[PDB]
């Protein structure tokens, strides 16, 4: 699956979306630099409206997961 397609479900817990996201990104055939860029660019962008609202308002992965 392309990492671009991993999007948080409307009722999916943020931790579960994070898990799916990292699993898919680990499976992508890409350099570590490209994978890092994808985490900074897609993780908040592909979150559902509720979590996007909280995340934008703030950042580490551990701060993101607590805020949601």
């Amino acid at each position: 699956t392309s990492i671009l397609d991993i999007r948080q479900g409307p009722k999916e817990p943020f931790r579960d979306y994070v898990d799916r996201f990292y699993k898919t990104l680990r499976a992508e055939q890409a350099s570590q630099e490209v994978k890092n860029w994808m985490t900074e660019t897609l993780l908040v962008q592909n979150a559902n409206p509720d979590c996007k609202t909280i995340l934008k308002a703030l950042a580490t992965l551990e701060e993101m997961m607590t805020a949601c």
Partner: nanobody
Amino acid sequence: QVQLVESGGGLVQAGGSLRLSCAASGSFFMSNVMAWYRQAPGKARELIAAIRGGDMSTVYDDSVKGRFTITRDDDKNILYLQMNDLKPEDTAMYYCKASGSSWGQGTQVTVSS
């Protein structure tokens, strides 16, 4: 399945250039992040370049740095991959991708010598 459509592939000698285009006329497809992938027969489809709208940040695989440039034209809704200084190792099918798009048929790049 908004399906993206790649074009601009061709047959060129090593050192030459190409420009791939990706579009879906009549479709609402440009996502905040877009990427180009490439796949040689029987090999993993690899993520080689990506761009993010707004700040226009870009990232590239080490094998294409300083040779390829990903750009997007927001008015025309076209994503491009400029390819300079081509190498036989660049020979592959190239695919573009947006968040939620279906995979296109790709465009073939063949580099001789």
